[PDB]
Every structure is written in C-alpha cells, then in structure tokens.
From a paper:
In that population, activating mutations in the epidermal growth factor receptor (EGFR), a receptor tyrosine kinase, are a major cause of non-small cell lung cancer (NSCLC). In contrast to ATP-competitive inhibitors, these bind in a pocket adjacent to the ATP site, not the ATP binding site itself, and inhibit the kinase by stabilizing its inactive “C-helix out” conformation. The V948R mutation in the kinase C-lobe aids in crystallization of the inactive conformation of the kinase, which is required for allosteric inhibitor binding. Crystal structures of several simultaneously bound allosteric and ATP site inhibitor combinations revealed conformational changes, most notably in the phosphate-binding loop (P-loop), that may contribute to productive variations in cooperative binding.
To explore co-binding modes of different allosteric inhibitor chemotypes, we determined the structure of EGFR(T790M/V948R) in complex with osimertinib and the dibenzodiazepinone allosteric inhibitor DDC4002, which targets the same allosteric pocket as EAI04521. The structure confirmed the ability of these ligands to co-bind and revealed that the P-loop assumes a distinct conformation compared to structures with AMP−PNP+DDC4002 or osimertinib+EAI045. Here, the side chain of F723 was observed to fold underneath the P-loop and contact the indole of osimertinib, which resembles the conformation observed in wild-type EGFR in complex with osimertinib. Thus, the P-loop adopts alternative orientations in osimertinib-bound crystal structures depending on the chemotype of the allosteric inhibitor. Guided by our crystal structure of osimertinib+DDC4002, we also prepared the biotinylated dibenzodiazepinone allosteric inhibitor b-DDC (compound DDC-03-033-01) and tested it in cells expressing EGFR(L858R/T790M). This probe did not precipitate the mutant receptor with or without the addition of ATP-site inhibitors, perhaps due to the lower potency of the dibenzodiazepinone core as compared to phenylglycine inhibitors like JBJ-12521. In assays with wild-type EGFR, we also observed synergy between osimertinib and JBJ-125, but only at much higher inhibitor concentrations due to the mutant-selectivity of both of these agents. Furthermore, combination of osimertinib and the dibenzodiazepinone allosteric inhibitor EAI00221, which is closely related to DDC4002 in our crystal structure, did not reveal synergy even at concentrations of EAI002 > 10 µM.
Numbering used by the authors: 700 to 860, 876 to 1007
Write the structure that this text describes.
C-alpha cells in the first residue's frame, strides 16, 4: 500500500540528538513538526551514510514501501522517508532503547518471566516475517527494541539488501540467507538475552568463526539456563538448516516455558524480582502502548 509510507519534506522534522552512529548511517532522536500545527512529535530518524543517486533512491523507495507494510505487534514498521542528497528514514521512537542495552543495564535484575516472554515475542515477530516471506538477515539483541519492559519489537529487517558471530554457517560460507538462517541468529539473540548482553565468541577473531563452527563448537550454556533452554538454542545452530526448529515451534516451546518460568531459568533472587502486575500493564498500555496485542 502506497499510503502506508509517508514522503516527508525536510521542513517537517528536526534532528535533536544522536542515538548512535555506525557504517550504516546515523540514527537521531527527532521531532516531527506537522505543517500548520504547533506540535512537536518525537520520532527516530535515520540518515544514511553515503549520498545516493535517483536510481538508487527508487530502489530504496521500493523496499521502503514493503517495510511500511508490516503490521504486527512485535515488528517495527517503517513510517516515512525524506529524499535529500542523503536519504532520511523515520520510524517510531522507542524511549526504552534496544533490548541489548536494556539487559546489560538491568543485569541480574531481570526475572525469568520477562526473559522468556521476550523470547516468545521475538519468535512471534520472526514468524510474522516468515509468513510475509521477508528474511531479516540481521536479527540480534541490538535489533530488538523495547517499547515497554513488557513489549519488545523487531527492527532493521531487510536492510542488508557483516555480523559474522550472529550468522549461520551457510551464510558465512555461501552468503545464503533464508528463514532458517534467521533461526540460527534467533538462537544467538536468545543467548545474548540469557547472558544479559555478553558478546558471543568474545575475543575470537571473526575470520576464525567459520572454522570453530565446522568443528562442532557452539556458544556455551548460560549459567541461568536449564538444559531444556540450552537444548533449544543448540538445535537452532545445527549445520543442517532443515533440522533447525521453525519459529512457530519456537513460539510454542517458549510459551510453555513462560507459564512455568522458574522451572526453566535459574536466577538468583528470582522470587524477589518484579513480575508485571495488571495494574502496571494497564498503565503502560494506556500511556504509550495502545496498539492491539
Ligand atoms: C541497541 C542500541 C539502541 O538502540 N539504543 C537506543 C535506542 C532508542 N530508541 C530507538 N527507537 C527507534 C529506532 C532506534 C534505532 C534504530 N537503529 C538502527 C539504531 C542505531 C543506534 C541507536 C538507535 C537505533 N532506536 C533510544 O531512545 C531514547 C535511546 C538509545 N540509547 C543509545 C540509550 C543509551 N542506553 C540505552 C545505553
Ligand atoms: O533503516 C531501516 C530500513 C531502511 C530501508 C529498508 C528497510 C529498513 N529496515 C527497517 C524495518 C523496519 C523498521 F521499523 C525500521 C527499519 N530501518 C531502521 C530505521 C528506519 C528509520 C529510522 C530509524 C531506523
């Protein structure tokens, strides 16, 4: 639907603060200023790194139309685009930030109910992408945004068209990207969460990752994970892509674990850590998260 993607004028928005910058461009916290109005609406703005040609822009715009067409409570959707010399893209601002920073910031103060529910929601969002037959190619804890502590959303999918330590072996060797290679990255993403944001294969050169994987080496069991959870992660990292679980199977398996969370994650002081109440859930949703879930 063409109406799902707004073409913006440069006067409609202003960048206020950098959220971070890489080789992929700069992402700013911004304000949307509707023409004729006095309101300033917080948004996220992405400025690409290189200036692009009109023909390059058309291809960017074609993909932007697809990314604006996703409609799922656990997937972020692209909202708008501004076609200057460098292209700027607009999406909803998530004030809580990304899930990677969140688990590092709340290290050891996150209960098992949150961690397992995040795994369900990420798998639900990935299952939606598969049903829309869109391959993410860069699923990681940095690309899961926190709408509320109870509600996370996948972002940055489809943009790669390299995160070696998140990629399936077939992607490293043959640059093959499928939904099953997304399942591999999902397993690494869950490992990031269960380790509260540790770096996978920390200290190991990226050039050597393909070698250790062929020998059967995998990421180690997180201390808080029971073998039931680690076994699921290990199945995600099988060489045979068709033997890896499917996302809808991951939804079901983590859902049952989420209804008995202390049986599947061993966390010191779990019986203290705040579980979300209906009171806190109604307040969060009425305030900043009114979408259907
Ligand atoms: C994982 C790093 C991160 O995302 N940090 C933050 C994210 C915020 N909200 C938000 N909303 C929509 C889109 C993005 C976004 C998308 N891409 C590709 C990004 C790259 C770098 C930074 C943000 C990106 N982000 C946010 O709103 C206030 C703040 C942060 N930070 C950096 C707070 C610092 N602290 C959490 C460590
Ligand atoms: O860059 C992109 C992006 C750009 C082109 C094609 C796909 C892309 N994937 C994507 C999917 C959903 C979403 F919600 C945001 C993105 N993004 C990240 C972005 C966009 C605007 C502002 C900040 C960040």
């Amino acid at each position: 639907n063409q109406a799902l993607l707004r073409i913006l004028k440069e006067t409609e928005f202003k960048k206020i603060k950098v959220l971070g910058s890489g080789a992929f461009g700069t992402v700013y916290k911004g304000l949307w200023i509707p023409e004729g109005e006095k309101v300033k609406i917080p948004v996220a703005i992405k400025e690409l790194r290189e200036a692009t040609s009109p023909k390059a822009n058309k291809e960017i715009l074609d993909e932007a139309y697809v990314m604006a067409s996703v409609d799922n409570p656990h997937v972020c959707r692209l909202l708008g685009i501004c076609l200057t010399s460098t292209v700027q893209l607009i999406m909803q601002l998530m004030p809580f930030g990304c899930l990677l920073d969140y688990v590092r910031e709340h290290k050891d103060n996150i209960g098992s109910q949150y961690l397992l529910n995040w795994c369900v929601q990420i798998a639900k969002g990935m299952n939606y992408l598969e049903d829309r037959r869109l391959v993410h190619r860069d699923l990681a804890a940095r690309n899961v945004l926190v709408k509320t502590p109870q509600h996370v959303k996948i972002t940055d999918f489809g943009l790669a068209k390299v995160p070696i330590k998140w990629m399936a072996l077939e992607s490293i060797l043959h640059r093959i990207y499928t939904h099953q290679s997304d399942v591999w990255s999902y397993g690494v993403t869950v490992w990031e969460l269960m380790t509260f944001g540790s770096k996978p294969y920390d200290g190991i050169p990226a050039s050597e990752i393909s070698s250790i994987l062929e020998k059967g080496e995998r990421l180690p069991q997180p201390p808080i994970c029971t073998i039931d959870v680690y076994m699921i992660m290990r199945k995600c990292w099988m060489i045979d892509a068709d033997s890896r679980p499917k996302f809808r199977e991951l939804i079901i398996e983590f859902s049952k674990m989420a209804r008995d969370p202390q049986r599947y994650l061993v966390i010191q002081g779990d019986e203290r850590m705040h579980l979300p109440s209906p009171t806190d859930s109604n307040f969060y949703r009425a305030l900043m998260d009114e979408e259907d879930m």
